[PDB]
Design an enzyme around this catalytic site. Structure first.
Site, PDB file in Angstrom:
ATOM      1  N   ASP B   6      -0.431   4.961  -7.949  1.00  0.00           N
ATOM      2  CA  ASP B   6      -0.868   4.537  -6.610  1.00  0.00           C
ATOM      3  C   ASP B   6      -1.684   5.678  -5.999  1.00  0.00           C
ATOM      4  O   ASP B   6      -1.150   6.761  -5.792  1.00  0.00           O
ATOM      5  CB  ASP B   6       0.336   4.222  -5.706  1.00  0.00           C
ATOM      6  N   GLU B   8      -3.858   7.291  -2.911  1.00  0.00           N
ATOM      7  CA  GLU B   8      -4.270   7.288  -1.487  1.00  0.00           C
ATOM      8  C   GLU B   8      -5.606   8.027  -1.356  1.00  0.00           C
ATOM      9  O   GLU B   8      -5.745   9.121  -1.896  1.00  0.00           O
ATOM     10  CB  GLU B   8      -3.210   7.953  -0.604  1.00  0.00           C
ATOM     11  N   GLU B  55      -8.926   5.438   9.354  1.00  0.00           N
ATOM     12  CA  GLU B  55      -8.037   4.384   8.843  1.00  0.00           C
ATOM     13  C   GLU B  55      -6.888   4.955   8.003  1.00  0.00           C
ATOM     14  O   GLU B  55      -5.709   4.682   8.275  1.00  0.00           O
ATOM     15  CB  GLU B  55      -8.837   3.394   7.993  1.00  0.00           C
ATOM     16  N   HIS B  60      -0.559   6.552   6.739  1.00  0.00           N
ATOM     17  CA  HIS B  60       0.619   7.408   6.470  1.00  0.00           C
ATOM     18  C   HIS B  60       0.499   8.889   6.898  1.00  0.00           C
ATOM     19  O   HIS B  60       1.295   9.722   6.455  1.00  0.00           O
ATOM     20  CB  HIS B  60       1.038   7.297   4.985  1.00  0.00           C
ATOM     21  N   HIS B 156       6.404   9.381   1.862  1.00  0.00           N
ATOM     22  CA  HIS B 156       5.366   8.772   2.691  1.00  0.00           C
ATOM     23  C   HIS B 156       4.036   8.931   1.966  1.00  0.00           C
ATOM     24  O   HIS B 156       3.739  10.009   1.454  1.00  0.00           O
ATOM     25  CB  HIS B 156       5.341   9.418   4.077  1.00  0.00           C
ATOM     26  N   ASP B 161       4.349   3.734  -2.251  1.00  0.00           N
ATOM     27  CA  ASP B 161       3.795   2.480  -2.717  1.00  0.00           C
ATOM     28  C   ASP B 161       3.968   2.355  -4.217  1.00  0.00           C
ATOM     29  O   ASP B 161       4.303   1.281  -4.705  1.00  0.00           O
ATOM     30  CB  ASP B 161       2.322   2.384  -2.343  1.00  0.00           C
TER      31      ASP B 161
END
Lengths: 72, 219, 366, 73
Positions: B6, B8, B55, B60, B156, B161
């Site tokens: 995952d 970010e 955004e 997070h 976090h 995720d």
């Protein structure tokens, strides 16, 4: 929607096919190019079928008016 | 052997190349072997090379000043490569992540080809979309669906995720297989319209034509 | 219509004939019996409209032919209720059936025999008899794998297949499968028929395993089974039984052998802490060891280590534990041999002494 | 000579309610766009859109043939 089923319900009846649309003259002529009488018999039956239902009329009933006119 | 990732990012470009002008900020990946969490997670933070997206910040909480001392993609290129090489890559919207991944790989200038040439690229969203067609197959959607806590998890960002997607992935690739099974001319009568019927026909067509001004039978 | 029979000639027939009675006989006469008296034979019918059950009792005392239709459950209970050796007198009084025993008197309503539905005559195609014993083992060995309610309604039943000297029965869910084959001792032509699950339950119940041979006839659209004087006939659900030869594992190269009881006890215990929906237990095989483990989201866990005869490589595999316990309960035997392929293939299981029955359950991915 | 050799003799409109799809006028306009001289409407156990049928037949030069479809015992 009428029958009260959800799309993903397996018990949903599947009684219809994608071919059930307004095929043209020629498309029907080739679908049944083994039975030409079947096409010709549509034209024949169409000629036999001639209905003239009642349009544009009125029909009142009456009323116990003795020996008197309805008017009177 | 199954490898969960995952990523970010510093937001996306909405037009053109979704990777153009952007770089990776955080890598959170978990290793999943025989549907069990080993705990040998790959969790690193990277150099932003740019501003963190407003955004992404609200998602997070990540500030640029935090990812400054942290190493770049070049310092963990080989490290991360060997960690996923020759395994299953389960991703959300593969076009997005793979695009970023290969983008960073080309920035290293080691002639690195696309990950799909040496690895099995699999999006989990596509699987969920096949299972639940036209339904929301987001992580939180599936989370609620398979009865999962995403609120009391300390991780976090990416690793959150990733862990959740692993539980969703297990849920989808449960429970149980299915049993491979499924699996002349002749005569025949023409009825010619009688003279009575022909007369009715003619009269009926007269009405159509006199009232409507046309007759195709006859057009 | 009159006949007189002894309670003890009626009792086992009556009990057996009353089995098919159950499912909500909307057409009220389904809750009743068909009586035909002719010769010294009263014939019984017990039916669910798709299958039929026939019984005879011999008439030693005076009899007179005739027919009517009495309420089955009520009549069965009265007879079962009477003492052994009690004298039952039947005699039709117009629109009532009178049942007497010495000094007690009971009167039954009467609906005409002529209203009882008649199933079509058909003829036999392939014919066989077999020892009750063989029929007993066959059913018992496989009944647990019947589908419960399936959209693939053809799986709600059992394939009986004949060829040469081999009958092999199979019943399945679409998930697991149990197979049993027995010798019948006569060369038999090939036929395939699926009898509906309720049918097989009733048939199971009529077998005491005893000495009268069982003789079965199979027609185009029906089946008929005679053991001595009792006769069960059912319809078949017609065809397209999928090819069970295709699902079988293709030479499982690894063997795992262990004490059936021990093994079964450990799985029953492990099952308690697995998933609601998926019944998930996780299994580790390693050099001469078997480790069973069970998990749930609340971190509750059962774990067993066991000494297992096994040659082959380490691998892990999960499954629905209820289905594997069901087979271990049907495996009434000393040793089991378990024959594997991998963590993601079905596995075949047999008695380590007979290849006659084979059991194959699919893996779960847990 | 006349030229068409086929007309549709079993067709349901939306007025059958158990089935059918297209509304009355659109179905009549298709028949005519297909160069057909007639079109039989056989709605299910009703003549509810007969007034619309007659109005569309007149408009398109189509001769009305009366039918209804049933389930029998």
């Amino acid at each position: 929607i009428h029958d009260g089923f959800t799309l993903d319900d397996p018990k949903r009846p599947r009684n219809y096919s994608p071919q059930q649309y307004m095929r043209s003259e020629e498309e029907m002529c080739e679908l049944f190019a083994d039975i030409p009488e079947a096409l010709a018999n549509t034209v024949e039956i169409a000629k036999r079928c001639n209905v003239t239902v009642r349009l544009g009329e009125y029909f009142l009933p009456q009323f116990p008016t003795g020996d008197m006119s309805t008017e009177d | 052997r199954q490898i969960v990732l995952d990523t970010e990012t510093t937001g996306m470009n909405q037009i053109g190349a979704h990777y153009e002008g952007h770089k990776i900020i955080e890598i959170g990946a978990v290793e999943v072997v025989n549907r069990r969490l080993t705990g040998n997670n790959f969790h690193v933070y990277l150099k932003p090379d740019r501003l963190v997206d407003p955004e992404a910040f609200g998602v997070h909480g990540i500030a640029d000043e935090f990812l400054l001392d942290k190493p770049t993609f070049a310092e963990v290129a080989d490290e991360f490569m060997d960690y996923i090489r020759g395994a299953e890559l389960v991703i959300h919207n593969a076009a997005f992540d793979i695009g970023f991944m290969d983008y960073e790989f080309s920035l290293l200038k080691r002639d690195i080809p696309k990950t799909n040439t040496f690895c099995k690229v699999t999006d989990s969203l596509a699987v969920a979309r096949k299972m639940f067609p036209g339904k929301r197959n987001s992580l939180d959607a599936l989370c609620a669906r398979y009865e999962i806590d995403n609120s009391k998890r300390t991780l976090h960002g990416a690793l959150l995720d990733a862990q959740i997607l692993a539980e969703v992935y297990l849920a989808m690739t449960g429970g149980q297989l299915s049993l491979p099974l499924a699996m002349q001319a002749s005569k025949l009568r023409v009825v010619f319209a009688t003279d009575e019927e022909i007369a009715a026909h003619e009269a009926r067509l007269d009405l159509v034509q006199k009232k409507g001004g046309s007759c195709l039978w006859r057009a | 219509m009159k006949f007189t029979v002894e309670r003890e000639h009626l009792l086992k027939p009556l009990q057996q004939v009353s089995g098919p009675l159950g499912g909500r006989p909307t057409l009220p006469i389904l809750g009743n019996l068909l009586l035909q008296v002719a010769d010294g034979t009263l014939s019984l019918t017990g039916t669910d409209l798709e299958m039929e059950m026939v019984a005879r009792v011999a008439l030693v005392q005076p009899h007179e032919p005739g027919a009517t239709t009495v309420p089955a459950r009520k009549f069965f209970d009265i007879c079962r209720g009477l003492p052994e050796g009690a004298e039952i007198a039947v005699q039709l009084e117009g629109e009532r059936m009178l049942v007497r025993s010495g000094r007690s008197r009971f009167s039954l309503s009467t609906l005409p025999a002529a209203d009882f539905p008649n199933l079509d005559d058909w003829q036999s195609e392939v014919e066989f008899t077999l020892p009750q014993a063989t029929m007993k083992r066959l059913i018992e060995a496989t009944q647990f794998s019947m589908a419960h309610q399936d959209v693939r309604y053809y799986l709600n039943g059992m394939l009986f297949e004949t060829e040469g000297e081999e009958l092999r029965t199979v019943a399945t869910d679409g998930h697991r499968l149990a197979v049993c084959s027995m010798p019948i001792g006569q060369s038999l032509p090939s036929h395939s028929v699926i009898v509906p699950r309720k049918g097989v339950i009733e048939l199971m119940r009529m077998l005491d395993g005893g000495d009268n041979p069982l003789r079965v006839q199979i027609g185009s659209n029906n089946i008929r089974a005679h053991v001595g004087d009792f006769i069960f006939t059912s319809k078949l659900v017609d065809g397209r039984f999928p090819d069970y030869r295709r699902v079988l594992p293709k030479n499982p190269d690894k063997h795992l052998e262990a004490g059936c009881d021990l093994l079964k006890q450990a799985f029953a215990r492990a099952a308690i802490l697995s998933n609601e929906k998926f019944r998930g237990v996780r299994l580790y095989v390693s050099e001469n060891q078997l480790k069973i483990t069970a998990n749930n989201p609340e971190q509750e866990e059962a774990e067993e280590i066991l000494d297992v005869t096994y040659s082959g490589a380490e691998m892990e595999i999960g499954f629905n534990v209820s289905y594997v316990l069901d087979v271990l309960n049907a495996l009434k035997c000393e040793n089991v041999r378990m024959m594997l392929t991998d963590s993601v293939s079905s596995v075949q299981i047999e008695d380590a002494a007979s290849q006659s029955a084979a059991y194959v359950v699919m893996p779960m991915r847990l | 000579m006349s030229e068409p050799r086929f007309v549709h003799l079993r067709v349901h409109s939306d007025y059958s309610m158990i089935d059918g799809l297209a509304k009355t006028a659109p179905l009549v306009k298709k028949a005519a766009a297909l160069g057909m001289p007639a079109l039989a409407i056989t709605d299910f156990t009703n003549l509810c859109g007969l007034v619309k049928f007659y109005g569309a037949g007149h408009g398109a030069g189509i001769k009305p043939i009366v039918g209804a479809d049933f389930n029998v015992q």
